[PDB]
């Protein structure tokens, strides 16, 4: 089997900049390396393929070289409507692989993620059930991990999270996540806590309340 | 214009089979060959086999090799490919291309839009909303954030507008997340303080596929 | 005859951990080891042909490795349906032989048992019998010890055990104890406890009664 | 589409012999191996003997040989597995696995869904359900714990139920275990200290074997 592997999951660059994404291939794959990209639709067209070098149908503004076992596609204008995941792939073995993709990102300052908890809601404690929710909205980069407390510690089970992409104006981040519990055990504590940790403080921004202050 | 146009089956029970239909248009059927990738929800791109109507025959990606069977009827000009087996790790994205040669070796030219596969055993529940509010009394002083949760529904998709589409900026729908067979996700949204409560806040979430339309306003308190 | 060995006889682990169960033969394997799966009812399936490396038509969160003597099966993201007992075999020589087998059991708080006594209900004792139960129910870790008396004694005759398989709402075990006298030495003593000690407290959460009071 | 069908449950003297079938169904029979796997309730998984539908079959395990016997019927897909002189320890489920083949291995791929043998001379009794009324809230404050003792019955399964079943959780219905030659479980139920006895609460214990139905209102006292 042949490994194509492309440093560079995210790759962050501005409207304008000329990118370059890079793929290697754990052996000399002899000038059969084909480029695919994937808009947000989830279609994916042919860019360029034959060790680059080679248009298909797609604008000039795309263009590919390498050899041996280093290749990178690039772009000379990056188009907004260039933010893709792009996968280089291998025809010179069975069975046919794929890099593992490098999606882009835009250029964004450090921004710092807004949190919000939010206790269950009457509607939802009548039927007996109780979600804790925790919003962290508008950060930068993306990386980001959220830790949960009742009264002051652990909880790791029944913690749901989801992420954004990247957002159309502003190129921030925003995640849920969700802590759901029975409405018994929920009732048994009074403190909930939602604490973000992001590369924008090295203090854990937390947001909490007290089942008793509503 | 060359066109891989395709479709199938796309909700099945675990242990199920499928089978994906690939239509070519533009060319003659039997001077090419079609690849199927896969694409689990996490991206990565899986590449199973390559069918050759012509010099009839195929040649599978260990791994997918044995659940699955590539066919194709030269007549209809239609590539079929078939999952046996089904599983849980195989609701995803199917993809099919055109190979050409051309100096070297092959590549994949045209790609379908590719079927979606969703392998559940769960059965169209309709979702229950319920509003997302400061809670502590406590505000954020300045601007607002208010939510929306959508538990326990299936299948997808949702829609989710605030005030019936007046409010716009500031508006975040999550991804679903698939909670206990079910699906569930949330929408916050943010507005001056001086709106809310003054000024009222609306979600109008609908589940097409339980004939669900409901409008959760946002009051105070709990 | 090719022994085979199971490194345990049961392992505890939590959904969304990676499990390792390992198989070791008496002699070089040649690497023809496979692996089967027994759900709590039974039912058991081919998991994993040819040295824990080849499957069936599993989940691809299965796998397992190894070579000579020692081989290993690997479930990765361990989900609810996969709480169940494997076993691994060799076709190499005849007669073909198993592993001891491993179970696989959910991680969850410690907790003692509830436990209740029962005297033998009137029907029961103009049927010439006594029967005396005791119900230890939901308690972690599954490890437990019972315990007769009979104004104050032994009672290693008699007694009749039974253990429920670990829960599946909660991760916790039951056991139900029973002493079978004959009425006649049944009236012949007062007190009939129950004692049950669980790595959960120094001093058993004893119950019992006494004939004269009822 | 490929499978093998076992054949109902053996109750049978010690002393005595009996023959199970397998059936398969869904590919050729005589292309395959049939092997036989013993199971007693001490989980332990065993192999007793292979053999060869197309040919004069056999090739046993120097234990269960000479004790056991397997045979065929082409003319019919099925296999069979004679047992002789039986005794407590030849008590187990017995499964029929297909042999396949893969570069020097073989392995079992498809199992059937086993059948139980019971080696007993007992005959079929209706069992005896006994009232298991709580006679010290010492125990366990605060909720109650009923029970149902069901004894000297033959021969399993025997389902057990609380108020129909409109009574469901907090109830453990234990293995049965084998105790005079009879079956013997019991069942525990907990509700609230409010709902008994003031709402009733009685165990329902079904008897296929016997034509039984046995409904148990627990009442206080002794």
């Known amino acids: 089997d042949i490994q194509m592997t492309q440093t560079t999951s995210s790759l962050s660059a501005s409207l304008g900049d000329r990118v370059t994404i890079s793929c290697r291939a754990s052996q000399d794959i002899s000038n059969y390396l084909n480029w695919y990209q994937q808009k947000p639709d989830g279609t994916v067209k042919l860019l360029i393929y034959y060790t680059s070098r080679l248009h298909s149908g797609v604008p000039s503004r795309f263009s590919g070289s390498g050899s041996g076992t280093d290749y990178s596609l690039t772009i000379s204008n990056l188009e907004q409507e260039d933010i893709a995941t792009?996968?280089?792939?291998?025809?010179?073995?069975?069975?046919?692989?794929?890099?593992?993709g490098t999606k882009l990102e835009i250029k964004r300052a450090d921004a710092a993620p807004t949190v919000s908890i939010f206790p269950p809601s009457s509607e939802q404690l009548t039927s007996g059930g109780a979600s804790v929710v925790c919003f962290l909205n508008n950060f930068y980069p993306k990386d980001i991990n959220v830790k949960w407390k009742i009264d002051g510690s652990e909880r790791q089970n029944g913690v749901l999270n989801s992420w954004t992409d990247q957002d159309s104006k502003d190129s921030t981040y925003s995640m849920s996540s969700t802590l759901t519990l029975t409405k018994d055990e929920y009732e048994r504590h009074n403190s909930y806590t939602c604490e973000a940790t992001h590369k924008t403080s090295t203090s854990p921004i937390v947001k909490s309340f007290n089942r008793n202050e509503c | 214009e060359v066109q891989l146009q395709q479709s199938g089956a796309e909700l099945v029970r675990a242990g199920s089979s499928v089978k994906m239909s690939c239509?070519?248009?533009?060319?003659?059927?039997?001077?090419?060959?079609?690849?199927?990738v896969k694409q689990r929800p996490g991206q990565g791109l899986e590449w199973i086999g390559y069918i050759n109507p012509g010099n009839g025959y195929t040649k599978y990606n260990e791994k997918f090799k044995g659940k699955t069977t590539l066919t194709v009827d030269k007549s209809s000009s239609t590539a079929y490919m078939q999952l046996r087996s089904l599983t849980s790790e195989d609701s995803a994205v199917?993809?099919?291309?055109?190979?050409?040669?051309?100096?070297?070796?092959?590549?994949?030219?045209?790609?379908?839009?590719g079927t979606t596969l969703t392998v559940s055993s769960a059965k169209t529940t309709p979702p229950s909303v319920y509003p997302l509010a400061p809670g502590s009394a406590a505000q954020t002083n300045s601007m607002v954030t208010l939510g929306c949760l959508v538990k326990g529904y299936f299948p997808e998709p949702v829609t989710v507008t605030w005030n019936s589409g007046s409010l716009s900026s500031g508006v975040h729908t999550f991804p679903a997340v698939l909670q206990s067979d079910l699906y569930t996700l949330s929408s916050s949204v943010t507005v001056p303080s001086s709106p809310r409560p003054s000024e009222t806040v609306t979600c109008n979430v609908a589940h097409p596929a339980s004939s669900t339309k409901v409008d959760k306003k946002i009051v105070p308190r709990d | 005859d090719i022994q085979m060995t199971q490194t345990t006889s049961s392992l505890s682990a939590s959904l969304g951990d990676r499990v390792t169960i390992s198989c070791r033969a008496s002699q070089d394997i040649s690497n023809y080891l496979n692996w089967y799966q027994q759900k709590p009812d039974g039912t058991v399936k081919l998991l994993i042909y040819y040295t824990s490396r080849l499957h069936s038509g599993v989940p691809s969160r299965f796998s397992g490795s190894g070579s000579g003597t020692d081989y290993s099966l690997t479930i990765s993201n361990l989900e609810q349906e996969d709480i169940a007992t494997y076993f691994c075999?060799?076709?190499?020589?005849?007669?073909?032989?198993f592993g001891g087998g491993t179970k696989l059991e959910i991680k969850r708080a410690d907790a003692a048992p509830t436990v209740s006594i029962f005297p033998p209900s009137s029907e029961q004792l103009t049927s010439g019998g006594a029967s005396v139960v005791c119900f230890l129910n939901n308690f972690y870790p599954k490890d437990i010890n019972v315990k007769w008396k009979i104004d104050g004694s032994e009672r290693q005759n008699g007694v009749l055990n039974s253990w429920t398989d670990q829960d599946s709402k909660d991760s916790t075990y039951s056991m139900s104890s029973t002493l079978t006298l004959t009425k006649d030495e049944y009236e012949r003593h007062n007190s009939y406890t129950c004692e049950a000690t669980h790595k959960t407290s120094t001093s058993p959460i004893v119950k019992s009664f006494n004939r004269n009071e009822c | 589409e490929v499978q093998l069908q076992q054949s109902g449950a053996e109750l049978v003297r010690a002393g005595s012999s009996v023959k199970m079938s397998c059936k398969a169904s869904?590919?050729?029979?005589?292309?395959?191996?049939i092997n036989w796997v013993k199971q007693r309730p001490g989980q332990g998984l065993e192999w007793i003997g292979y053999i060869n539908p197309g040919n004069g079959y056999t090739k046993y395990n120097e234990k269960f040989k000479g004790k056991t016997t397997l045979t065929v019927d082409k003319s019919s897909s099925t296999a069979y597995m004679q047992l002789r002189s039986l005794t407590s320890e030849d008590s187990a489920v017995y499964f029929c696995?297909?042999?396949?083949?893969?570069?020097?291995?073989?392995?079992?791929?498809?199992w059937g869904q086993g059948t139980t043998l019971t080696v007993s001379s007992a005959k079929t009794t209706p069992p005896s359900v006994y009232p298991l009324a709580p006679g010290s809230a010492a125990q366990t404050n605060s909720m109650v714990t009923l029970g149902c003792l069901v004894k000297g019955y033959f021969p399993e399964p025997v389902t057990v139920t609380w108020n129909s079943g409109s009574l469901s959780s907090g109830v453990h219905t234990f293995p049965a275990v084998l105790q005079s030659d009879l079956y013997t479980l019991s069942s525990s139920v907990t509700v609230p200290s409010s709902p008994r006895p003031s709402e009733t609460v009685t165990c329902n214990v079904a008897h296929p074997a016997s034509s039984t139905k046995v409904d148990k209102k627990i009442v206080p006292r002794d």
């Open positions: 075999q060799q076709g190499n020589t005849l007669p073909r032989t």
């Open positions: 696995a297909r042999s396949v083949y893969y570069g020097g291995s073989y392995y079992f791929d498809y």
């Open positions: 869904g590919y050729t029979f005589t292309s395959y191996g």
